[PDB]
Amino acid sequence: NLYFQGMSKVFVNISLSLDGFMAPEGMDMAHFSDPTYKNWGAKWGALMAWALSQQYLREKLKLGTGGETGPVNDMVRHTFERTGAHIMGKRMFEGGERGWPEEAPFHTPVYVLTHERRNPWVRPGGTTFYFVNDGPEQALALAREAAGERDIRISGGANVIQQYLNLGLVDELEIALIPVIFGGGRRLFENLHEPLPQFRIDRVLASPTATHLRYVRL
């Protein structure tokens, strides 16, 4: 595609356990209010700790003050600022419906892939959730239209990312690889079929608690 560089990029940016899980076993709606179940809360906390320690996110999410202010924080600023639309699945959405503040932390249109017929959900702070029932290509078409000159983030979870991977639609795959082993949960790289996606390493940013890997489609 000769004009690729002028097009909005479709990217994934996630935190992954060393063993390849995006969520620990027991992190489901049934146990959402009991984080001691299979110690899921502690595993989740270990996974996200790097991010929640970045000054920029701490400010943006109103978590508190202080935080780290290096290359990783600048990276996290760019991921937020570059995004014009988000795409996610229903399990991620259900978790957030209960765990996000009223001012949802997207501030863009968000396209939720679900079989449920549901009207859009407006949140203060410039987030509207749209419930898309006709699949990932249509969600992406809507998202590209909404994103303008900015990029499209496939937020997650794994089931939705797998579909975009299988469709050949992920331009950039960014992974914070964390030195925690979950032993179970939602495996990112599962249910992939041929032709499989192909990537090269574009950049690595090492840090004491996470290795930040950036892959771009071949």
Ligand X SMILES: NC(=O)C1=CN([C@@H]2O[C@H](COP(=O)(O)OP(=O)(O)OC[C@H]3O[C@@H](n4cnc5c(N)ncnc54)[C@H](OP(=O)(O)O)[C@@H]3O)[C@@H](O)[C@H]2O)C=CC1
Q: Which residues bind its own copies (CB under 8 A)?
A: 18-20, 177, 179-183, 189, 192-194, 196-201, 204, 206, 208-211, 213, 215
CB 87 within 8 A of CB 65: no
Cα 40 to Cα 26: distance, rounded to the nearest angstrom: 6
Q: Is 143 in the site for Cl ion (CB under 5 A)?
A: no
We find the least distance from the C-beta atom of residue 77 to its own copies, in angstroms, to be 22
Annotated binding residue 48: no
Return the closest-CA partner of residue 155 out of 215, 211, 85. 85
Q: Which is nearer to Cl ion, 116 or 194 (CB)?
A: 116
Cα 91 to Cα 109: distance, rounded to the nearest angstrom: 18
We find the least distance from the C-beta atom of residue 1 to its own copies, in angstroms, to be 21
We find the least distance from the C-beta atom of residue 51 to its own copies, in angstroms, to be 16
We find the least distance from the C-beta atom of residue 206 to ligand X, in angstroms, to be 19
Q: Which is nearer to ligand X, 51 or 146 (CB)?
A: 51
Annotated binding residue 92: yes
Q: How far apart are the first and last CA of the chain?
A: 12
Annotated binding residue 163: yes
Annotated binding residue 138: no
Packing angle of the helix pair 136-147, 158-166 (nearest 10 deg): 90
Q: Is 16 in the site for Cl ion (CB under 5 A)?
A: no
We find the least distance from the C-beta atom of residue 134 to Cl ion, in angstroms, to be 5
Q: Is 160 in the site for ligand X (CB under 6 A)?
A: yes
Annotated binding residue 159: yes
Cα 132 to Cα 135: distance, rounded to the nearest angstrom: 7
Annotated binding residue 204: no
Cα 7 to Cα 98: distance, rounded to the nearest angstrom: 34
CA–chain centroid gap for 188, Å, is 11
Return the closest-CA partner of residue 20 out of 167, 198, 180. 180
CB 72 within 8 A of CB 57: no
Q: Which is nearer to ligand X, 101 or 148 (CB)?
A: 101
Q: Which is nearer to its own copies, 64 or 183 (CB)?
A: 183
Cα 191 to Cα 183: distance, rounded to the nearest angstrom: 18
Annotated binding residue 143: no
What residues are designated binding site? 15, 22, 90-92, 114-115, 157-160, 163, 186
Binding-site members for NADPH are 15, 22, 90-92, 114-115, 157-160, 163, 186
Q: Catalog residues that contact Cl ion under the rule CB under 5 A.
A: 116, 132-134
